[PDB]
Swiss-Prot record, chain A:
UniProt-recorded name of the protein: CRISPR-associated endonuclease Cas9 1
Role of this protein: CRISPR (clustered regularly interspaced short palindromic repeat) is an adaptive immune system that provides protection against mobile genetic elements (viruses, transposable elements and conjugative plasmids). CRISPR clusters contain spacers, sequences complementary to antecedent mobile elements, and target invading nucleic acids. CRISPR clusters are transcribed and processed into CRISPR RNA (crRNA). In type II CRISPR systems correct processing of pre-crRNA requires a trans-encoded small RNA (tracrRNA), endogenous ribonuclease 3 (rnc) and this protein.
Taxonomic lineage from the root: Bacteria, Bacillati, Bacillota, Bacilli, Lactobacillales
Catalytic residue list: 7 (for ruvc-like nuclease domain)
UniProt domain comment: Has 2 endonuclease domains. The discontinuous RuvC-like domain cleaves the target DNA noncomplementary to crRNA while the HNH nuclease domain cleaves the target DNA complementary to crRNA.
Subunit field text: Monomer. Binds crRNA and tracrRNA.
Highest taxon listed in the record's lineage: Bacteria
This protein's encoding gene: cas9-1
Binding residues annotated for Mg(2+) 2, in chain numbering: 7
Biotechnology annotation for this entry: The simplicity of the Cas9-gRNAs RNA-directed DNA endonuclease activity may be used to target and modify a DNA sequence of interest.
First-to-last residue of the parent protein present: 3 to 321 of 1121
Binding site for Mg(2+) 1: 7
Amino acid sequence: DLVLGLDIGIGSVGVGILNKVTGEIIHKNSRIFPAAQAENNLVRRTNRQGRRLTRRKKHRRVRLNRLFEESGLITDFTKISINLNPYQLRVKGLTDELSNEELFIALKNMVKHRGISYLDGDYAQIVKENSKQLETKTPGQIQLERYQTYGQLRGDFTVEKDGKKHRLINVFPTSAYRSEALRILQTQQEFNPQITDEFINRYLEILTGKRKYYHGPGNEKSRTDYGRYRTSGETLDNIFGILIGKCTFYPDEFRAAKASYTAQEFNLLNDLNNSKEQKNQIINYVKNEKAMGPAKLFK
Amino acid sequence: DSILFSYQVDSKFNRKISDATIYATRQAKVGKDKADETYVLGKIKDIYTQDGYDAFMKIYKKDKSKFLMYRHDPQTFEKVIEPILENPFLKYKEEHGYIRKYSKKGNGPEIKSLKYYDSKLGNHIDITPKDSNNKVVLQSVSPWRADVYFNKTTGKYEILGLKYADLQFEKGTGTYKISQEKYNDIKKKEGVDSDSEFKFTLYKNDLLLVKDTETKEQQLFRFLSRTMPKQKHYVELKPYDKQKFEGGEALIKVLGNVANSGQCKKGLGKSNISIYKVRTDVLGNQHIIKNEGDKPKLDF
Amino acid sequence: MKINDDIKELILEYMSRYFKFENDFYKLPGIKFTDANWQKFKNGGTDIEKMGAARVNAMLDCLFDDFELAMIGKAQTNYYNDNSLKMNMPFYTYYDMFKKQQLLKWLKNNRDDVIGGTGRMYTASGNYIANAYLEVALESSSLGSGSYMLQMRFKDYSKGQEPIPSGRQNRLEWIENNLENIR
Amino acid sequence: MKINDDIKELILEYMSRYFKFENDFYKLPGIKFTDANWQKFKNGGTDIEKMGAARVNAMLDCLFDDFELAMIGKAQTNYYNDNSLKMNMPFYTYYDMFKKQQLLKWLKNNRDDVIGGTGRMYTASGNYIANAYLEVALESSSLGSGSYMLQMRFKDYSKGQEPIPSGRQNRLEWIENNLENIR
Amino acid sequence: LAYVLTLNTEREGIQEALEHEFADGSFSQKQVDELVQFRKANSSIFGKGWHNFSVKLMMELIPELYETSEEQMTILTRLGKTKYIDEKLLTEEIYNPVVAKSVRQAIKIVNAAIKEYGDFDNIVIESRVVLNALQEHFRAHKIDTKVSVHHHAVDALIIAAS
DNA sequence: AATACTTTTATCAACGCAA
RNA sequence: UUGCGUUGAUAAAAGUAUUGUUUUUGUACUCUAGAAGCUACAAAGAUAAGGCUUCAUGCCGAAAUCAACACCGGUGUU
């Protein structure tokens, strides 16, 4: 007997209700809410992942302190001089003897700046030019050369040479840092015998260790809802495995892969049906006999 | 004009507490100074671009003593204003190179940036490190809600203000709340007496009702925030029908008229006034309250 | 307690310990000095025993916890009964000794209820100092709404640029390792 | 703490509780009223917040223990944050409630360290009142020379003419049986 | 094996899915390494996607497909809160955040109005998801109600008259 | 507090084959 | 309305790298081994205020959810 009406907008709905036999207003109202901005979730997500990066850098330094204190090299970490040049000790310890405290300085500075690992487009051209330079030296030699030639070391900065101008950058791959750290640790192993091979495997695990993009955050006893160690007690294998969609008619079943026998025989059947003997004949022919193709199927 | 409105309330508690930018202050004498004062510093990021020269000449045509090099290295500033006489910094760069400082020889450092005394210190959070010498702050501190108190021995209202950064993760169990002693400090600063009765608390887009005592008038507002934190009880309000208060529009007798900008920054800490809170339905049925509970909600 | 010149020295010491500019303190609501009158109070001019009761109690309430005023009374009882203490050290050094004796008794008797945290202090203009001091409490003596009956208040004077860690076990280990650097 | 009119009512209540003639109290050394000025203070004339700091601190130091002033501060924090307490009961009744809550927590958590005794109070003329109050302390919190850090102070309002027994077990049983008669 | 090779994209995920999901599989290392190089060889073909159907319905249907020339929608034709209204459909079907918000606040308005006054027959909205939602709720609740798809209050009053 | 890279899952549109 | 094959737009979540801001210290620049803390370069600490336990490829903190109160997914009123 009554008629409802709604005017839907971006941040408002106007609403009314009438009777239509008399035509008097039974109710009218205006409901106002703020808009659904997607810029705030982008801000929140960006800040969360930046906080994770800062956390994991500090945890690498903490793990290095624990490794250096457990193996008994240095007792306390308050008398360490912060006014020594780390690149000079990093290039010196490749052939000479580091005095047990400059070794900690060199390894801490090396674990503070590791490298990129997606490589294994101007930015690509600059990092390939830098790789074309590092094929004969370690990156510590490159950084010390830039330091004692131009004064600057860090950032991205341009230098005018005698006849040309090139912009320099501080980006090296992780393999070069790992090779340099392995060389320094083998030379100091030849000098100082407290650095066993398990120290070198633990330090290289701290240096080149990264997570996988399908793992996420968390640990076995850390229980994150953003990572594979779910907070319900279980453990996923790949976190994009619970995001795969449902079926179209039974909304509780996982989908199938497109690249198996089942979906492919279903697709050939759906293109063939718009009888049974030559259905099976064409299907076993395409299944078992090779050098196949669409023009070959029409032939 | 018998239409009813219905707004949505904003009562979330953990939002952006401040900027993440770390500022620097100095104590100096700038302008009309009879004592030292704390000044937030600034920086021209690079002077050879188009923006850095414009910012430099803006500061220069405002006041010359704002630059820190003007007070700590004067002859280098003389060799900075010899180029600006005859041309600018980009032309000096494309002929002679980087603008080095004053020295005996050509071996001083280059000049790419310049700091100055930007502004005076307002709302902040003191995040000064342990072994530091000047103050270090965080700016842009936002407000969250208001608690309205009322005492009988004066017969007028007093108004608190809580920010997002007044709450904390606590030290034994990790809960998000504010203590009672810090709340007593916030009550003391805003001028609330100890023996006042807590009436209610106001969030943003919460419907306020102002009634008078001598001439029986009624006005209805939306609350926004707790502006002007130098003198007390000032509240920023917004209309109920529209989104703005443009003009010198009159509201009721005892409040006055809106300013020339369009902002309604009133002082509700006065006698001859009365406040209710309106809690609407989603269809607009205004229900009026006078007492919320016994104590303000402090644990979340 | 007893109000005398030793309380004036203790007040000026703890003000110089927690606040870094003096005008953050002497303009607080309830205290409310003026610049000439603050210079009169600081430089020995005004006798502390004939001032207002509410002003001196507001200064002591800002600088000290509620358990710490009780410990001030007990150290005043013990201090004025010995010539070694009265003729060798000032009163704020003996109050520091009394406070660390109570902390060591807490760590010995019941180590697994000692909690701690970062303390926050409001200035005269409404803006707080984040990380003004270190709070140390006993978790068994809780009243409710984040209040503790037995609670003390320290400040670290370390020379290293590493902060106090979070978590119960890590902060307890930091407190046990740095027992000469806090004061 | 905070000094206001509620502290004046609390002072007059506890003076009427421990001393039986008022001139035993207002002529003590450090307090030292006169008869006209005591009638001015008592009958509402003088505001307590602008008096001397040492005199009000001497009155509070005579009537209360050192732990009890801390409990006054904590009850003042909790009392002015609630309209039920602020508009129903005066402050000395809520201070009594706070004090008995702390005593019940002591009896529940650690019953075998609660000791007690008979308290003795000096008048203005040098002669004491024997058995002025009942002292209740925790034996673990001893400082030395007969001082305790955590100590409270009660008065029995029983209607029977039997005294409190001596010995640890007998006095603890009396305290547990008469928990509504002490105040 | 198709699931494991489609979802995982590099060596350790492939390896531990083949070692961990195939219960008592006892696969060798040689075939694991050659499946790693095989997945590395075809990324454009094998990382195609996921089929929109499930293996339960398709194992219901692959034998049936053969005996008759019949199409899928006609084959599936041939095989075939207690008073208030749900938030299921309005939280699932999200086209934009703005559309999701506005339609769910409007549906709160709708169900408050149907709680207050009573029954209805005509509902007007100034698309088809909300339409068949309301139409199936009203048929399932046995109610014949036809749903059809200052200033905004006046405009809603005007289209309620229209 | 911004700029460079890598990857996954899902949804709308529109361009066709069929119903 | 439903499935398949192309290519645009979007959303949600994950892993990394290099700076930026800021504090101390050192070196240079300046004024007489001291001082000023401007202007550069390099180390080390912090990076929304903070907080947790399991002791680590550790974890959480800037979004959305919304009128309150009483009695059996429902039920009553200012």
